[PDB]
Design a binder for this molecule. Structure first.
Ligand code: EMC
Ligand code: EMC
Length: 303
């Protein structure tokens, strides 16, 4: 059932130029490209362009476009957004905003003291960490408001803009440089075990509450510059540790307010964990002045 985006979201094919491949997405390759006159005030804009694999069935091709129509309804400064779609002709293209600094996991790793790709920037300050935290929690609040359960929130699944704003978004690369971030629990499916709440591991259920747990892990990744959670434990060990009530070690030289927030996320009982809106409420008093201008939290949409 092909459901198409509004006229405003259709992009003339001639306005998109694919430049190089960024990597694999759920339906196929993702490319970095240029889109002309796609954003007001900009003659050209760097974008990420998704396509469906040429081996995909018609059904999968239709599903690829229908998903873009869904993603079209996710409009929040703290969520990577759909800029447009070339639905007519082959191949169909879903144009997404390109985050200048890529995913958060790779960005954090580049900030390490001896990283070869170190931007010449210092690891995030307390202030920047709290800002990132509120942006992530805010985008997740928006998504949860849309009844979306991420199921794989992690720094690898967040992206960094040119001004360092962190947004919820990923192309669909479970298998990538981060394949090791997933494990076939019981020889079954690939699960992001080191990011999963104890109840998800034990019963396979995922909720916004399990998303909150993962959010705590993301905060932890910011503090550790994205080390592997429970790096000293094997996948099997992580399963037992976490199901037994274990959680990550409180980061060093980090305020009680922050570590406590992390501890709340890691509450064993999902019911005891904060909601994403509560997370933002908790950090709202010390954020960049633009925050109220763009957050779902301070929006008329937060109902
Ligand atoms: C303004 C809703 Hg993120
Ligand atoms: C990344 C500051 Hg506790």
């Amino acid at each position: 059932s092909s459901v198409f985006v509004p006229d405003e979201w259709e992009v003339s094919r001639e306005k998109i130029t694919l430049l190089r491949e960024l990597g694999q997405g759920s339906f196929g390759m993702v490319y970095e490209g240029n889109a002309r006159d796609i954003i007001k005030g900009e003659a050209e804009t760097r974008v990420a362009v998704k396509t469906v694999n040429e081996s995909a069935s018609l059904r999968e091709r239709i599903e690829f476009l229908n998903e873009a129509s869904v993603m079209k309804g996710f409009t929040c400064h703290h969520v990577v957004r759909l800029l447009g779609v070339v639905s007519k002709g082959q191949p169909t293209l879903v144009v997404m905003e390109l985050m200048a600094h890529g995913d958060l996991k790779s960005y954090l790793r580049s900030l390490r003291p001896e990283a070869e790709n170190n931007p010449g920037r210092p690891p995030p300050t307390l202030q920047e960490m709290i800002q990132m935290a509120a942006e992530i929690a805010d985008g997740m609040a928006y998504l949860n408001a849309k009844k979306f359960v991420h199921r794989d929130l992690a720094a690898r699944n967040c992206m960094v803009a040119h001004d360092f704003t962190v947004k919820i978004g990923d192309f669909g690369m479970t298998r990538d440089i981060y394949e090791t971030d997933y494990y076939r629990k019981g020889g079954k499916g690939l699960l992001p075990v080191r990011w999963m709440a104890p109840e998800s591991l034990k019963d396979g259920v995922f909720t916004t509450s399990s998303d909150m747990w993962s959010f705590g892990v993301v905060l932890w990744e910011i503090t550790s510059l994205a080390e592997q959670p429970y790096q000293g434990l094997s996948n099997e060990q992580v399963l037992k540790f976490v199901m037994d009530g274990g959680y990550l070690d409180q980061p060093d030289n980090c305020p009680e307010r922050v570590t406590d927030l992390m501890r709340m996320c890691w509450q064993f009982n999902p019911k005891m964990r904060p909601t994403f809106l509560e997370i933002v409420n908790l950090l709202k008093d010390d954020l960049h002045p633009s925050f109220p201008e763009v957050s779902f939290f301070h929006s008329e949409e937060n109902k």
